[PDB]
Each structure stands twice: as C-alpha cells, then as structure tokens.
Write a protein that binds this ligand. Structure first.
Ligand SMILES: Cc1cn([C@H]2C[C@H](O)[C@@H](COP(=O)(O)OP(=O)(O)O[C@H]3O[C@H](C)[C@@H](O)[C@H](N)[C@H]3O)O2)c(=O)[nH]c1=O
Ligand SMILES: Cc1cn([C@H]2C[C@H](O)[C@@H](COP(=O)(O)OP(=O)(O)O[C@H]3O[C@H](C)[C@@H](O)[C@H](N)[C@H]3O)O2)c(=O)[nH]c1=O
Ligand SMILES: Nc1ncnc2c1ncn2[C@@H]1O[C@H](CSCC[C@H](N)C(=O)O)[C@@H](O)[C@H]1O
Ligand SMILES: Nc1ncnc2c1ncn2[C@@H]1O[C@H](CSCC[C@H](N)C(=O)O)[C@@H](O)[C@H]1O
Lengths: 240, 240
C-alpha cells in the first residue's frame, strides 16, 4: 500500500477529511489568533507539509502573504490549484532553504510524525527556526504521544460528493515507536462503478520531551497546550 | 472475487443484511400467512437456497417441520448451527431429490436468479413441484424483471458488532440478460486489524413470462404479486 500521499489517495484527501468534520476555516482562524498573541504584527506565514493547501487558503485571508512547502508532488498540485497566487515549494521539511523568513512557520495535522528519530525531528525544527522572523512564532501540531495514543482504534465514515460515495476505514496499531495506521477506501458511483484503494503510514510516537528538545536545540523557547486542533495538543516556539 | 457464498463472505452475511434492515421475522410471518391462505392446514416447509437459515429459524415457530436445501457448504454450516434440530441438505436446487413432499416449498430473496437460463429455471421449478404436497404451495421470490432493474445502482452501509466494523458497498450493471452486482467489504476491529473482501454475482433478469413458463411447465398454476419482501414481488404456484 502507498505511503506517499499520491494518485487517487491524494485526490480523495480533501473529501475524506471534510467528511470527518475537519474545519480548516476554524483552525486557520485559531492559528491566526494564536500567531497574533505571540507576534502582534505578523504579516507572512509558511505552512510546512501543507498538503492540499486547505489551511493556506484560509490563512491567506488573515495574513498578507502565505507560502507552502510539501513533499508529495500530487498533494502539491492540488494545493497550487487551490492557492494559485501563493508560492508553494516542492521540498522536504528535513532540509529546505527558501532564503527568506516569515512571521509564522506552521506544520499542522501531525505532519511532523512522518519524521523518524530525534535527528530528523531536530533537523526539521532547525529548518523552522531558520525560516522564522526574530519576533515571530513556530507552531507544530504533534502526533499522539506514546502514553496517550489509543492502539486498536478504528475510524469508519462515508461521505458523498458529486454523485460518488466514498467510504474510508482506518485501523491503527502500536508498531514499536510509531502508530501503524492502515486506511482502506471504497469509492462507488453509478457511472464509475466500485474501486478499492489503500494507504499505510508509520507516524512516529515522539514523546513530549523529544519535541521540547528539538525546539530547544533549534534556539526556540517551547510551550505545549493540550487538546489543540486534533486532540494531540499544539507546541509553539519563539526564537531566542 | 468469489461467487460462491463462502469463507468470510458467508460469515458477514447475516450482519450485513441485518444492517440493511432485512427483517426475517416479519418475512417469515408474512410467508406463513401466505402459505396458510393457499393451503390452510400446512404443517411442513422446505426452504430452498436457505443460505444461513434465517428464514427457517423463524418459520420453525409457525410450521411443525421445517427443512432446508443449500448449495454453499459454508452458508449451510451457519444454517445448521442456527437450526440444530432441522434437516438441512447440501445440494443444488436444479437437481435434488429428497424423497418427501412439504406443504410449502419456498425459495426466497431472489436466490432463483443464480440460475443461468430458462432450462435451469424450468428444472428448479420442476424440482419444487416434485417436493410440494398436492394441497401445498410453491413460493418463489424472483429477482427484478429487466424493465424494473436500475443499472448503476449503488448500495453503501456500515454496521458494527462486537467492536468489529463492517462496511459493504455494491455496484450493479446490466450484463447481457443479467445484473452483474459487485460487492466490496472493509472489516476492521481493534485486534484483528483491517481487511478487504469482495464478491461478484451474475443474477439473471428473467422476465415475468419466463417465470410463468417455468411454473406452468412444472404443472403449477402461477400467480405474481408485486411488492413482496424486497420490492421484487413474489410468485406462488399451486399444483394439480
Ligand atoms: C479519536 C482518537 C484517535 N486516536 C488515533 C487513532 C488513529 O491513529 C488516529 C485517527 O485516525 P483517523 O481518524 O483514521 O486519522 P486522521 O483523520 O486523524 O488522520 C491521521 O492519519 C492520516 C493517515 C494522516 O494523513 C493524518 N496526517 C493523521 O492526522 O488518532 C487516538 O490515539 N486517540 C483518540 O482519541
Ligand atoms: C432497491 C433497488 C434495488 N435494485 C437492485 C440493484 C442491486 O442489484 C440490488 C440491491 O443491491 P444490494 O442492496 O447491494 O443487494 P441486496 O441486499 O438486495 O442483495 C442482492 O444481491 C446480493 C449479492 C445477493 O446475495 C442477494 N440474494 C440479492 O438480493 O437490487 C434495483 O434495481 N432497484 C431498486 O430500487
Ligand atoms: N519530509 C516531509 N516534508 C514535507 N512534507 C511531508 C514530509 N513527509 C510527509 N509530508 C507531508 O505531510 C502531509 C501529512 S497530511 C497533513 C497535510 C496538511 N498539513 C493538512 O493539515 O491537511 C502530507 O501532505 C505529506 O506529503
Ligand atoms: N443452484 C443452487 N442451489 C441451491 N442454492 C443456491 C444455488 N445457487 C445459489 N444458491 C444459494 O442462494 C443463496 C442466495 S442468498 C439468499 C439466501 C437466503 N435465502 C436468504 O434469504 O437470506 C445463497 O445461500 C447461495 O449459496
């Protein structure tokens, strides 16, 4: 099964996350406000692992300039179509270099859990701090911690759009120091018939302290707020 | 994709048809009342293609002796477990010979559409007539008539039981004089993880006249009533 957010899996991403109730509007509003508490005059924002560019489309209404970075060509193409006047870069959060800084650097919906190892987590946070202005803010939404992840968790939901029915079912296990989440889809419509699709991801269960250490090593002060967009909390970092 | 009602598919059958809202309890009572209209003192009943024996389990409360016939060993295993004191035969509705006759011979939920052409349909009706008492009745629930079938129809539902979630989606097309219905499942539970299953059936769209021809050739009078347990109506046949 693919792990790379490509092809039909990428094409299905928006529909299934909206169908599950993800509200990128509220999240963007909440982000913009959190960003402004820490950095009252913030003007620009880079969203790293920006996926299909849903946060970016809403954040564009709150920030003068927004920009993205995304590893998967196929997610990125959706995001560019959604954000045709923003610059969105094809690149890797572990090692990119844009030559410019932003009032905010965000990395949402546990994209950071695609990293494996303290070294990768450290590298990425060093990048974020390399792209943040001196009076701005870095925001990283973590994955679950080892101690609060619920192994055996199943999600199942169905959404219909454009005449096509899409069912998504995930199962998640504790696979060592990461969550194995295996997701299957069935997609059906009168004219297209039925097709089955599948993806599978290891999403690293970093501990709180590992994130705190990566913020620290990057020069940032770090704070953690439990709950957050997805239940997993939110870490914010200020340069210093 | 299997076409033989076996393995996991046979194990998911009752749960999926329950989830879709099938009520074998009402259907058996309705069938018991139909049978006593045409044959007031009927006392025994053979359910042909009895599947998991859901009809028989309820028909046992209305008829003193029930018996089943079923082609899939795995469906039949479930039926026997459910109907421990009835005789349930492993065999083929086209060519079976039990050496006794019943007040009612029934064949429900369009199982008759698993037959390929007029010759098979005629042969199963003649076998039904061979197992019906002279003052008894044959009941056959047809598949859709060609004019009443909707190509492109999609069914999608998700049910959960025992912490296992089961999603079933089907899509149907016109294939020569039959419906091709392709059915996919996703089944996930905390311990067993997630799996995908699929089945596919060709169910013949016999016309009303083809059914009537088969009944009449078997020496049965024939009547069709629209509606019925599934929208497809019901044929009844009386010998003599
Ligand atoms: C409700 C809940 C879920 N979880 C875990 C179980 C599973 O690993 C995840 C929810 O899985 P989902 O709803 O199928 O996934 P979600 O929409 O959150 O997306 C997640 O996985 C997908 C594959 C990634 O692309 C995405 N970046 C992740 O947020 O969070 C918990 O640990 N505790 C919980 O209370
Ligand atoms: C309600 C309705 C159904 N149909 C046809 C379309 C499709 O082929 C079928 C319903 O699909 P389903 O609900 O997925 O199938 P159902 O539960 O009726 O079961 C049927 O297909 C399965 C595979 C057989 O084991 C079962 N013996 C059949 O009755 O019936 C129509 O053509 N028009 C309709 O309005
Ligand atoms: N090393 C890496 N650098 C950049 N993006 C990455 C990455 N590894 C995974 N990703 C991206 O991480 C995203 C995880 S899904 C989250 C997408 C988006 N942030 C949203 O909130 O909806 C995917 O788009 C995936 O391609
Ligand atoms: N030639 C044949 N003889 C007997 N059973 C058959 C058959 N072809 C298909 N079947 C059976 O037909 C059934 C269709 S599903 C309907 C099962 C059951 N009558 C119910 O109402 O739930 C399955 O059990 C299948 O194995």
């Amino acid at each position: 099964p693919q792990a790379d957010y490509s092809g039909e899996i990428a094409e299905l991403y928006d529909l299934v996350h909206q169908g599950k109730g993800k509200d990128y509007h509220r999240e963007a509003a909440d982000l913009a406000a959190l960003v402004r508490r820490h950095s009252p005059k913030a003007a620009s924002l880079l969203d790293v692992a920006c996926g299909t560019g849903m946060h970016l489309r809403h954040l564009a209404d709150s920030f003068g300039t927004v920009e993205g970075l995304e590893l998967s060509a196929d997610m990125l193409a959706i995001a560019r179509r959604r954000n045709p006047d923003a610059v969105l870069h094809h690149g890797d959060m572990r090692d990119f270099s844009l030559g410019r800084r932003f009032s905010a650097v965000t990395c949402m919906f546990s994209s950071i859990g695609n990293l494996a190892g303290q070294a990768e987590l450290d590298a990425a946070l060093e990048r974020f701090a390399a792209h943040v202005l001196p009076d701005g803010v870095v925001v990283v939404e973590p994955w679950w911690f080892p101690e609060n992840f619920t192994p055996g968790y199943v999600a199942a939901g169905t959404v219909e759009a454009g005449g096509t029915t899409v069912t998504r079912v995930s199962h998640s296990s504790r696979e060592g120091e990461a969550t194995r989440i295996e997701v299957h889809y069935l997609v059906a419509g009168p004219d297209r018939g039925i097709t089955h699709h599948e993806e599978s991801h290891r999403i690293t269960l970093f501990t709180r302290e590992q994130y705190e250490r990566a913020f620290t090593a990057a020069g940032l002060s770090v704070e953690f707020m439990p709950g957050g967009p997805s239940g997993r909390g939110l870490f914010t970092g200020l340069p210093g």
